[model samples]
Target: PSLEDLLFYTIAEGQEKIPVHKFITALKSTGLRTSDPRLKECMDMLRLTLQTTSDGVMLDKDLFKKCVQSNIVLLTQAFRRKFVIPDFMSFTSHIDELYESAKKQSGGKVADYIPQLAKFSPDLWGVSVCTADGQRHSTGDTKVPFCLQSCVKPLKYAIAVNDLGTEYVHRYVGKEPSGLRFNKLFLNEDDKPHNPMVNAGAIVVTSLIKQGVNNAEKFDYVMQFLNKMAGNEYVGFSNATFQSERESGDRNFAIGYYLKEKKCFPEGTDMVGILDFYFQLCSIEVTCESASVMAATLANGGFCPITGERVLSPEAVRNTLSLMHSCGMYDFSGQFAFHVGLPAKSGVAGGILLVVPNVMGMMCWSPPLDKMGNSVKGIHFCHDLVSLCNFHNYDNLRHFAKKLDPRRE
Candidate 1:
């Protein structure tokens, strides 16, 4: 297929074709990021409109591209407006179906080891979705709060990259997937923690979060990033989880000491502070609603989908999502990358943060877990999602340079 097959097009407003202005409404009905308040008053200056829906705009794709070529920033915003999830049945109905379907499998156990996690109702479940321009829909008990657990690792890694740059941060942490438990005290072939999604690597980057800053200041810094990333969504702490884990976090202490023993951290890194920060980050609380927006931030290459503020660099997002795809899950990472084929991170608290690049970011939560520490229902939902939609990384193509579409014109 030719590249034109991938271009966004309209089926015409009840006919084969029409001119642009006839179908493209002003700021109100363009079905794009015109929701940005700043874009409302400027419609007079920008007449370009994308063909969004079946009966939407009659877009002149090539002409629009040329008109915006003089300003690359405007050109990017136009393309971003084109970036969209499939217009499936509807958002809430699809999520509810996924929820009810997966909720029946009561085969896994709640995380009882944490003591606090055991207190959550195993029956509690929720799912939420946030598209790039901030459209949202959630089902079930989406506002229910849970700890970040390992889910915080991806955010920290991205923040570290935002601050220290990729090359410098990677010196203390490798990008390979560790085949062992996430908390296992080991490094990769390069003597660094095997990727930032795991325990040791998170601890390592917790130190680099403003490497020389005071412990309290460092915690606030990290929390600030999370709060902003969620676009005013909930970002709080779970002192109960934090206290319980700090009391019995023997495995974590062992990993921290191991990193220190191996000199895997910076020259003057504070081992205790780093460990404290790591536990603190994992103890942060998030609801499925907010967590989905957080995932959307990653999906938008580090920008908050709702706010349109750059939270992470494009380079950092590429590297972070690359690691998340390859190493986010524990031993199940490879299988997930193969089957689900999305960049994601799962927490022991039963939160699944999923990112479909340029499409949407979503979260699903149920307190029950399988042996791999992944949410059983979460994995089931993802399986169903990829099957129902053309979202899989490889689904749009059969092989490298394969025909873009069977019915290509």
Candidate 2:
């Protein structure tokens, strides 16, 4: 059977158990017809259908199966017609090699500015990818747990927005990018921190956790929220890292005190308690595999794709991604936005969580710090992946759109 014939028969008959031989035969048949414009058109349609239909498909079993079929067709065509590698083969190979290479090259020192982070070996690097349909791929020290570090900012900011709505949250933290270091003490003239991705805004957001809850309760709430998002209740803090963060968190202490003086934090709010909670939140440990699932939760619109549990409202997720786009990379925000073109958050502990809404989730970790304190290896990996796959938001589709003749109108 030709690829088109098999796809046609399967869809027409609604068959779920198409044999591998028939599938390969179909692929080969499609491959043989190089100059058929209609074949190419079919491939493009399949790709578009796959991309457009996958979102929310997992909520319904039948719809999920249809979506899977669309994805398979899209992947197959993308391999043969677009990239010239078998979809599964290319997917598995690229991910596997990226993982191995990252692990091998993972020898960079941990950030010592935070005492707790310095205890971790610089040689830890891991990568994990999770799809919306519960498919996961991981390699290297993917299961090795490390502090969540700055990665906690996005989730905490999301929770604040969820509790108080964007209006209230904005009153405390501006959405504008600071265009400064994550630890910079800069604030807008309105007394609001530049955005939630910075230490200043993060401390403010943590302070805004529902008023009745005590500091301990607030920390538990954040952890519980993250656990629910990853579909794992066991996720919690690394005591050593927590202690280290508390010991060496003088800069954060300064930021908290400054915010307190500026009335960014409520009156009589214990600067010590607030900073403690923030440090503890950053100390929560998660493996790269779990990290990818967390990103997948965001990508799937605040719901855990694997567990089907709604962790936050869609509005909160959107707000979180908006902040990540503008401020997630610290001082490197503009470069990351221009290059990778995805909403992502990075931590000093050498972890990066990327959310590609309605598609996939990526997690990369490397301890080496660039001059800006961003994960050197993580940034490199992301840049390479974006370039090789043309995964940047403004790539292939933009090029295709530009080639069309608008004069016909």
Candidate 3:
């Protein structure tokens, strides 16, 4: 094999790219430690290839590309097996089938409650997935920009869990699913909002977002947190959507004060200011490409797959995924968990953020919603996705040969 084989997977069948560190993981998986003589001997070779970034190594750039061609063959499958990424043609073909099938079966309407969201084309649809190893797949209007809406809940809750620790964060929010509407204004048996995936619970989650600050300070902290999670991708604030939600936010305010009465917010917090932060976060805009990486961050156990940065602790990600599996899709979450068996979050803007544990992350956009607020085309794609592969968290044939990739061996 050429040195290009040792470099990251640059999609010719698709435009997606996986990271170089993923290539490193494949090497280490064969029990080749950093202490291996051949590896350390090549460190000078690899070190010359890597650039010194302010935060870490620039392993994704062009410098590492050239060195691998000459020396990376030292660790090739000639001496050891390595991780084989998804086949671009096979993966994209399945995605195309799902997209084409779902695009034809339009069954829901755009969310008209938010004035700006209502302006979106019901026909605007897309699907994107970024594997934990960084390979990507996108089809149709994948670049279409939409506000995160409820999708930000999982991210915000993760940050809080990372900051305050799960035991403390769960003091303000419960992990149990609330078997009611997404916007229901009740807490769990613990007298806290029932999991961070619902409206009532997410508002409580928003309160914990940089709790001791003005609206500006808190929102800025959050915006930075989001872009980092997205691997510095398209993260934007939508004032029109923010203002629209704020003006029509009586229900959220009611939930906020209700949580206040229940003492569900962080102690000594500004109740009104926290509500504004909630709308601001719901208004953060991202494309399917960026959201896929954000989902992949969780899939990679809170690490950014491309950058190799720890955005959230593995502990926090575990809690976040647990809650997402049970409550992320509103009332449809139970069915989603049962059928797809993946951790997922959905938004009123028709964005569904899904994580396939250690495998990959997917973002599906279809600006139409079922009665329960989950995306129509998005759910259909998830159903078809797990049908094609063993991505489900509890697939029956996980250890079976039909699911094994020969490339990984």
Candidate 4:
């Protein structure tokens, strides 16, 4: 039998017709969504077929074949357990357990420097994961919208590198971690911001995006890139948060002036305009579901997992991940790198964008921040995740067998 027929029978289970809910349920179990863009044709055809069929709730083999033919390769991959995480159900169950464990943590406070950021309830916690093959799973508050905050650093840095190339981007900002507070007035030996993951470095990198263009054009350009990276899920802006950030942005303004004095920006760059752009980027909104896709885009080597479209250059992604590994966290970069051993960035809004290189990407959000300005529950969840799964960069060394390899059958 052909792939479509095999997929139909697998779902039909020797029955004459398959109920549509059964098919959708089976599809979700493989970590794909009914609304996935890649499956749009198949989903649309299925909807049309149901309307035309004698019984709208069921699909016979011929009808099923017709509906799925438009995206048979993806459907076959899902049905045949060929996605990155083959045992998606089991892996997701583990993810749920980790979520529940992290949910009970009660310490740490939400950031208040930005007035809007302080309004979030500390009880909110969510975890969403998207594999390189587009397998997706999320548990707890996954649909709630939140600001990206410092989590947007890597994204903008990626965009800068993607548009300007690694060599050009680094000419203004260094690649080394600052090894100081994220907002400290510091520069490296070369008098440049010591890596794009920090405020000084990020501001310098921000000035490089679409230089000389109006702020509207620059913001739209980056938003479009972020939307594509998120697979067109939900990339939005919070003007209230943006205004609050600008109002309370004395520290960022200080950093900007410092960079300007140091001549860290490109020639003729408007430093204030760039800080405003940086604030706008940080205030960008995303649900955990969409943020996970952004992380997955990085994991998939700059290609969005669900959309299957390349959004960033390989050089951009490589340099971005390398900096994220070295300096994404505030003062906890060394500790986080030592323990989690993955590329990750944490935001004051209690979001952590984590990447498992060539495997999966995750976004863990909570409204409570640790001492280092990282999400408290998010950090716990990440630690527990790597503890349960061998997802650490060096976990597979010497065939270590204690941790579970979820990708293995």
Predictions in order: lDDT = 0.76, 0.70, 0.77, 0.89
lDDT of 2 by residue, 1-409 (tens): 4454444444333554443334434544332222222235434543554466565321222333443353455534443444222243346467676556555555456687755666667777788876554445666778878777899899888888877898888888889786555345558888888888888888888888866778788877777888887767236678888887777777788888788888887665777788888888888888887888888888888887656677889999999988787788887888998998888899988889987666667688877777676787788777766655545666664354333211111
lDDT of 3 by residue, 1-409 (tens): 4455434443111324434466555554443334333355456656654545433533543454554544465455322333234344466667788889889869998899877988999899999877665566788888878998999999999999888898888878778887655345577777887788888888888887676668898888888888889888778878999999999999888888888887877668888888888888999999998899899999999987655678999999999999889888988888999999999999999999999887778799999999988889999888877776777777654374365331232
lDDT of 1 by residue, 265-341 (tens): 88998897788888888999999988999999998888987777888899888888899999887878999999989
lDDT of 2 at 337: 88
Best by TM-score: 4
lDDT of 4 by residue, 1-409 (tens): 6877888888888988888999999899888989899999999997787778557598878888988988999987888888878999999999999999999998899898777988999999999999999999999999799999889999999999998898888888889876555346568888888898888888888898988789999999998899999999888899999999898899888988888888888898888988999999999999999999999999999999998899999999999999999898889898889899999999988999999998999899998998889999988988998888888988874486788888878
> What C-alpha lDDT does candidate 3 achieve relative to the native structure?
0.77
Worst 10 residues of 4 by lDDT: 177-186
Ranking by TM-score: 4, 3, 1, 2
Q: How accurate is candidate 2 locally (lDDT)?
A: 0.70
Clashing pairs in 3: none
Judge candidate 2 at residue 179 and give its lDDT: 50
Model 1 ranges with Cα > 4 A deviation: 1-83, 86-91, 180-185, 397-409
